[PDB]
Design a protein around this ligand. Sequence first.
Ligand SMILES: Cc1cc2nc3c(=O)[nH]c(=O)nc-3n(C[C@H](O)[C@H](O)[C@H](O)COP(=O)(O)OP(=O)(O)OC[C@H]3O[C@@H](n4cnc5c(N)ncnc54)[C@H](O)[C@@H]3O)c2cc1C
Ligand SMILES: Cc1cc2nc3c(=O)[nH]c(=O)nc-3n(C[C@H](O)[C@H](O)[C@H](O)COP(=O)(O)OP(=O)(O)OC[C@H]3O[C@@H](n4cnc5c(N)ncnc54)[C@H](O)[C@@H]3O)c2cc1C
Ligand SMILES: Cc1cc2nc3c(=O)[nH]c(=O)nc-3n(C[C@H](O)[C@H](O)[C@H](O)COP(=O)(O)OP(=O)(O)OC[C@H]3O[C@@H](n4cnc5c(N)ncnc54)[C@H](O)[C@@H]3O)c2cc1C
Ligand SMILES: COc1nc(C)nc(NC(=O)NS(=O)(=O)c2ccccc2Cl)n1
Ligand SMILES: COc1nc(C)nc(NC(=O)NS(=O)(=O)c2ccccc2Cl)n1
Ligand SMILES: COc1nc(C)nc(NC(=O)NS(=O)(=O)c2ccccc2Cl)n1
Ligand SMILES: [Mg+2]
Ligand SMILES: [Mg+2]
Ligand SMILES: [Mg+2]
Lengths: 582, 582, 582
Amino acid sequence: TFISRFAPDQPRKGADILVEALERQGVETVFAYPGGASMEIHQALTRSSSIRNVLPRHEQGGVFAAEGYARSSGKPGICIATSGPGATNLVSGLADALLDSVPLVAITGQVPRRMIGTDAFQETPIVEVTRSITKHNYLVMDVEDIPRIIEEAFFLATSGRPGPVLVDVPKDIQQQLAIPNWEQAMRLPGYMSRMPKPPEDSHLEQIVRLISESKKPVLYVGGGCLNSSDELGRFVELTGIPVASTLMGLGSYPCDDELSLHMLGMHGTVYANYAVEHSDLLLAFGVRFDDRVTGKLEAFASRAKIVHIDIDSAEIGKNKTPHVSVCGDVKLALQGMNKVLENRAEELKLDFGVWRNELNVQKQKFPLSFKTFGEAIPPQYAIKVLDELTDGKAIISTGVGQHQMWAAQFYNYKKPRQWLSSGGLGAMGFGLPAAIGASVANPDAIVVDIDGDGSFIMNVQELATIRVENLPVKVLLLNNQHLGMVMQWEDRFYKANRAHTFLGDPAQEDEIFPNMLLFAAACGIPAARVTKKADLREAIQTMLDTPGPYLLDVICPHQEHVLPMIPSGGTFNDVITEGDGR
Amino acid sequence: TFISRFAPDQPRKGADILVEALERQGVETVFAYPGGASMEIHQALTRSSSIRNVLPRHEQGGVFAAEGYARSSGKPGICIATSGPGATNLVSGLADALLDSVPLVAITGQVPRRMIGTDAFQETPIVEVTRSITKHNYLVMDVEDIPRIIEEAFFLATSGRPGPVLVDVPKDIQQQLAIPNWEQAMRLPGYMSRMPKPPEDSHLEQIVRLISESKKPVLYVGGGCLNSSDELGRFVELTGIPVASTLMGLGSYPCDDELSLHMLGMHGTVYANYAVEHSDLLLAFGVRFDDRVTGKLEAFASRAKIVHIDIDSAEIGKNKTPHVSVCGDVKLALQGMNKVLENRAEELKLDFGVWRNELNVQKQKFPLSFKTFGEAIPPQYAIKVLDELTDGKAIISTGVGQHQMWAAQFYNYKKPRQWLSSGGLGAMGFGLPAAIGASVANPDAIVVDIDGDGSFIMNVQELATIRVENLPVKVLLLNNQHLGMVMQWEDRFYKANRAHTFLGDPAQEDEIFPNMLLFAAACGIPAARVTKKADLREAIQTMLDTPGPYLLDVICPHQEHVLPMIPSGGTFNDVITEGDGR
Amino acid sequence: TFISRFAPDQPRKGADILVEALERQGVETVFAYPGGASMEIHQALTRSSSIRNVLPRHEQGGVFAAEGYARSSGKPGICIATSGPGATNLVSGLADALLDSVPLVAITGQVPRRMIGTDAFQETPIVEVTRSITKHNYLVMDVEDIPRIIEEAFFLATSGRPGPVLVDVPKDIQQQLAIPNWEQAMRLPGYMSRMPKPPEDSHLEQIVRLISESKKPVLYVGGGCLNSSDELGRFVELTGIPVASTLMGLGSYPCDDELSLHMLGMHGTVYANYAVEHSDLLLAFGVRFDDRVTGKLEAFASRAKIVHIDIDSAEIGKNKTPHVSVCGDVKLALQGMNKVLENRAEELKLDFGVWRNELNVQKQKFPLSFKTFGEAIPPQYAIKVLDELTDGKAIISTGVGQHQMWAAQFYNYKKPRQWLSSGGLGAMGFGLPAAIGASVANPDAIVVDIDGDGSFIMNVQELATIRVENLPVKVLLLNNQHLGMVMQWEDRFYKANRAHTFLGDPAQEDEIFPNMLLFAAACGIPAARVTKKADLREAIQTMLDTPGPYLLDVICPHQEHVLPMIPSGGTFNDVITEGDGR
Ligand SMILES: Cc1cc2nc3c(=O)[nH]c(=O)nc-3n(C[C@H](O)[C@H](O)[C@H](O)COP(=O)(O)OP(=O)(O)OC[C@H]3O[C@@H](n4cnc5c(N)ncnc54)[C@H](O)[C@@H]3O)c2cc1C
Ligand SMILES: Cc1cc2nc3c(=O)[nH]c(=O)nc-3n(C[C@H](O)[C@H](O)[C@H](O)COP(=O)(O)OP(=O)(O)OC[C@H]3O[C@@H](n4cnc5c(N)ncnc54)[C@H](O)[C@@H]3O)c2cc1C
Ligand SMILES: Cc1cc2nc3c(=O)[nH]c(=O)nc-3n(C[C@H](O)[C@H](O)[C@H](O)COP(=O)(O)OP(=O)(O)OC[C@H]3O[C@@H](n4cnc5c(N)ncnc54)[C@H](O)[C@@H]3O)c2cc1C
Ligand SMILES: COc1nc(C)nc(NC(=O)NS(=O)(=O)c2ccccc2Cl)n1
Ligand SMILES: COc1nc(C)nc(NC(=O)NS(=O)(=O)c2ccccc2Cl)n1
Ligand SMILES: COc1nc(C)nc(NC(=O)NS(=O)(=O)c2ccccc2Cl)n1
Ligand SMILES: [Mg+2]
Ligand SMILES: [Mg+2]
Ligand SMILES: [Mg+2]
């Protein structure tokens, strides 16, 4: 079926083998920045006609783009970098991919094998450096292993709990001529035997049983449900259980639905956190009981039976000890429970209307809210407008901080892989590159990066990439001249004592600095600024209607605070629902 | 002597202790970017009146600035970052500092101790990640250890072979109140006992003896001589031995001197490499026999007695086996030999005029040269002009690649700590941030970053820093629209098959992209472009005369090649002296 | 309360501090073998009047003795060794203690700090070597830390899941004078916060509920119940659930009871494995679903709801995924469930008589059995006799192999800490030293080491220890001239092809070699041999009645096979119930 470009008996460079190894895996796009140790690989890349390379302007841009690509498509993201500085520049991306469980395969060039460990030119023990921040990594010591290792990397990166896998390739191996063997079996006996088996009906029926016995059930859905949109949907229309989502799970269940409790956690809706606080049955599907969501573990869902379904056994009982657990693919567990629910339907007569109403009153007394001051632009409103004008069908990537929380709170994601945000590591400068990857993976999609002025500038060099690759990336930059989230904490716990959180120029305290419009102009990207809430709709509409890349600099008053808010390690009774930096 | 800001019996936060620990070390400047895990530290920082913080726009900018500061002053560079993404963003800087032996102390915030290892919010096992890329690192587990650890870090970072040291500080320890003890003794028994003792007269006199017995001696000076400018100078006027320098040693011995052979190695002068190739006595002072300098080890200085003086025993005999060695401070060895040379002068009658002439004919037949095409600007010429107009008194930082080689070849550094360049790791995007650190460390100095368009854009966000900090940083950007060095290799070994080395926009192949002038404008930094060699002097002069920051975009034809060139792993007989991309 | 031997302000050697640190922990016995690096510690030991040292003849003897002491008392075992060879000789003991979760604190001397890493005299990176085979270890770098580290070691070794903890003490620190501070707080924030909290009533009642709903319940008790003898007993008299035990759990529930199913697993009774195979509710208390017990995981308790209570979260769901779990002290869970069971007793009306009878028929059709040939001594019978003559009140330690299985199968342990056997690592030569520790910990107890001729000889040198310490250790040596278990496997899966499993002398195939009686005589220990089953009772009785140490060499035909037997990775349907080496 696969048509190679070399005779089955014709020897070729290891670099060429590595590229074919990629084509055989179905790869079509890679984000690679050339360097001495990886030149051979780049040369091999130009010989490929099925793989396109998106040259970033910084290796970190490359990784984040790869993540964007992966997070928005469901396939693994591939980035390539040279040795030393090239390799060390991917570190944040790898750590990010590991914490958010994003399938990713990073390939780095290395100095020739014989020089490893000699402090050679541009040498870095990347395998050693990245062992704790990757799902697994390799150091290819023989051209003969390229096929097997590549197959294993993709397998490991995509199977079970997705994650990043790095493959270190010495330059001399890239040049070694050889005849590849694509029939070799992978050496993952331990991993294979550990792979969860399909869920047992005994376990699933016990769950359906717990549901019928509960009066206040609550679904706690996370990043693990990203591929169970339909299954989860059906499950909810068969149980009528309210759905609370984590930052990573947004979109698994349409935010625009009456059964939706929206996001829970530190900055979750009061009703979502309420539901969990008073639930008698917590269905944790594809979540990891993060401190951002739980606060004080002992107080989290303290009055209910916890059912936890996870593909990673290491997560079951890590922070919260479940009453019932299922180590497997939540998608399969849902399909299983759905059948049981469809059959034993009449005899179950599930009805949580009383609970739903208890929550709907909370949803009404404590809804998400924002204040409008004069003609100042409320960031929440801007995002709300983008939603309307894009009809909630846009792929949204973001930076980290307040704008990120608002992008999560005021945009209703219809489907998963529409929300691209760094949740676990929370790495700034992720938004723009991620958008780049998402755009390449979804050419006909509306891609909007809702960024912050601090996050946006970190990888601003990627604007060059966007132009040269002619990607229709839109940038909704919520400019508040500060490091928002840190500022909010200064206001709340440090008597508003500013400590290096102001990003503008003190010499001209009132001038917007820098001028993001000029960064755009430098890369030939049309841009505009908005300051009056009245001009907001037309401005956003323009951004959307203008073909190609576009940057809309939205000025916002910095004293805005993300609400509600439960201080770190706090309880639902510690939730803050009012106040700001004014 | 030291006046604290807290009563000797008044308990204060660990954060405040950490800051005082810094003041007690003489620190006046730190490059810190605030984050949740490091908020306490930033708050403590604002309470200090002796330490100023230069807020970068990217943690990598912070590290590189810290390196710049260190490399240009001789003191350790200090950078601070928050946990997770903050910490991972320093990795390239740390690796860079370790490979170039730059004294540096990096401090990172960590999640609260009890949460370590739980995949907490913004958590990264930084100590684990950085163990192989730092001279040493720590994880503070008790506020009581802050004083001792900080003292040890600075001691380790600055003593022996300088290098980076990272200190991980959990947030809960930053908040813990305690009464510091500054009298605690450091726990470095192994390290202390390993510290080299002053050189023995027996060893030194044997060397002076080898000198008198040699007819073709050659000094091979490196980064280890950065603090022996005077000693080395005197040594040369007492021996008349020609001096060859490494990329890291530039400036140790004035490049503008008849005894100077300039730089040796891959892109060294033909005469410097010649001298070493035919020397009978190689005096390797403060060097590490890097593959970039030696090429094929067996062929390197194959006909001579090698004397190697290094502060690191691990380096003596690592790649080249010496005939005579001295493990100690080259500065002391030089002072020692100088005395011997001054006394036994008359009885020594050292005269290598014949050797010097054999070399001076080579210096005349094979000098550094460049071609001028029409009115196109030769990068070599631009750097040559900057030298003249600054009278070689400027602190020069650079990026990596061809421009870097030219900045090394065509500027005559009078003193050490004037040349700030990433040699071992060769990290791109180092130039601008490094200049920032150098400027802060040397407020009244002329600081010029000779950058490349590829390297410059990677950390372009630091332009914001330069403006807001009102630093007189000048940027001599040699714009060739390509990744020069990789391009050169494509031309030489890949039939000029371009593979992602073009940085401009293919849609407008002839338009200069991006427009670096607009990046400058965005940060309110005056800029200008030059294309005609005729307008070069006036342009540079303007850059220099214009008060404050300035960016001069110098367009250069990309087909330029760095020469001479000895291919990797090659011999002096493999040196390439002609040709380019035309 | 504690009376030191030094003035509260009088400085003393670190060695003396370490010893007092031990006395303050309640230590009374340590097993230490002197060496250069630990001389100071031994000297300090002689100054103590509350701690006695039992000098072994081999450091391995020391560790195994320490394990014996711990396993038979419930307190931690303490062994001390010098640097290098001393330290490496404890390795098997540490690994053994970790796998069986035996509380143990090992202290080793180290070379002076400054010499660490220099390949010094008798130096070994023991901390590095033992990191993967100890619960935790330390390298003391300052005399000031001795108090804290010792406290932490004992705390870590005894709390949660007990295990070994090694403390490396450099010689120079042993000699350093200092004034100890016993008030210092331990630095175990992570560990402390991880310690399981008392079980919740919600979880416990769900379990009691599952019990009332089950028809075929089976208790699967392990080493975790060693301190819940009473609780478990009460639990069984309130539920009437049959009890199956692991090799490590023997004695938790009296083997001489109608509700007892005895041991399960590879060599478990047919009825115990049957019960588990057909159970609908498996109560796994204090077990780790070892491959020796489960065989093929998918087939293990495949038809039942698994409730797993473990003090180590890492164990819950490791090999078998539970339906219900409880991470906590099984002792507390039992006390909790017992109350619920006592109250809701009448309304529960628990009665599993039908199940018990289904099992009692199996217990009758497939009981433990052995064949008697002529006058040859059946090892099973010998152990059976020892049981009778000691009235099952003896502390039994063993070696590894067939004799071990028989000691487990044919002796009815009344209480826990009566069975001392290496289960996880299965280390030979454990029996004799372990008995030594058990005897010292229980001076008035009958201590019998049921050993094998292969296992017995490995640490035969400890016979010297037994004599000199005048310990009433009895040795019931089942001599079969072979490596029994390996031989059995040769017979079963290798066509009885002997491969180095014969321990006698081939020159005299029929002579018993060696003559264990003479090893005993060498250490002045009375001994005797038995060959005829008729003389067995009188012989054993003599061994028991003779005051002091005694060795009874019991000759047995080697063709005996342990039965029943389920081949590794097998199913209950693969159980072998007949055959031998004849
Ligand atoms: C400024 C900031 C503020 C934040 N505030 C909040 C907040 O208020 N609320 C909030 O929710 N988060 C918040 N976060 C995000 C937060 O840090 C965590 O990233 C997020 O809570 C993790 O959610 P998750 O566990 O659901 O998803 P993940 O972290 O993606 O974990 C998914 C889990 O699902 C399992 N799984 C994966 N695939 C499958 C499958 N096929 N079948 C079954 N199981 C599977 C995994 O192995 C894993 O255990 C914030 C982050 C930042 C940067
Ligand atoms: C594109 C590119 C091209 C390059 N081309 C060249 C080239 O052609 N020629 C070239 O020279 N380099 C070149 N390099 C730089 C090269 O990679 C190495 O960084 C450089 O050769 C190292 O020189 P060094 O050993 O002298 O200095 P360092 O790497 O700084 O090593 C100094 C040594 O001195 C010892 N020492 C330190 N302090 C003291 C003291 N007080 N007393 C005694 N000993 C001490 C150290 O411990 C160490 O062993 C290039 C780099 C790049 C990025
Ligand atoms: C030759 C040979 C043959 C063998 N044959 C068999 C056989 O046929 N059958 C068999 O059973 N074994 C057999 N074994 C022993 C076997 O290898 C394992 O050591 C044994 O099965 C382990 O049993 P366990 O899990 O119950 O106990 P352990 O290994 O001691 O594990 C106890 C578990 O309890 C938990 N726990 C500890 N303290 C507490 C507390 N206070 N509260 C709650 N939980 C706690 C632990 O953390 C752990 O997970 C054999 C060994 C050898 C050498
Ligand atoms: C300036 O040196 C340089 N520039 C490019 C673009 N490529 C390389 N390649 C190179 O040196 N390759 S090598 O494999 O012989 C090598 C030798 C030692 C350490 C690393 C590497 Cl990559 N060099
Ligand atoms: C959005 O969360 C956030 N933002 C800021 C600016 N600071 C913090 N700090 C925080 O959570 N501190 S904490 O020490 O309680 C902590 C708990 C768990 C993991 C990491 C950290 Cl720093 N949070
Ligand atoms: C034969 O050497 C010897 N014998 C005994 C009984 N004790 C010691 N002790 C010794 O050498 N102590 S030392 O602490 O100075 C030491 C130095 C280097 C390496 C290890 C040790 Cl223990 N020596
Ligand atoms: Mg902002
Ligand atoms: Mg360039
Ligand atoms: Mg035997």
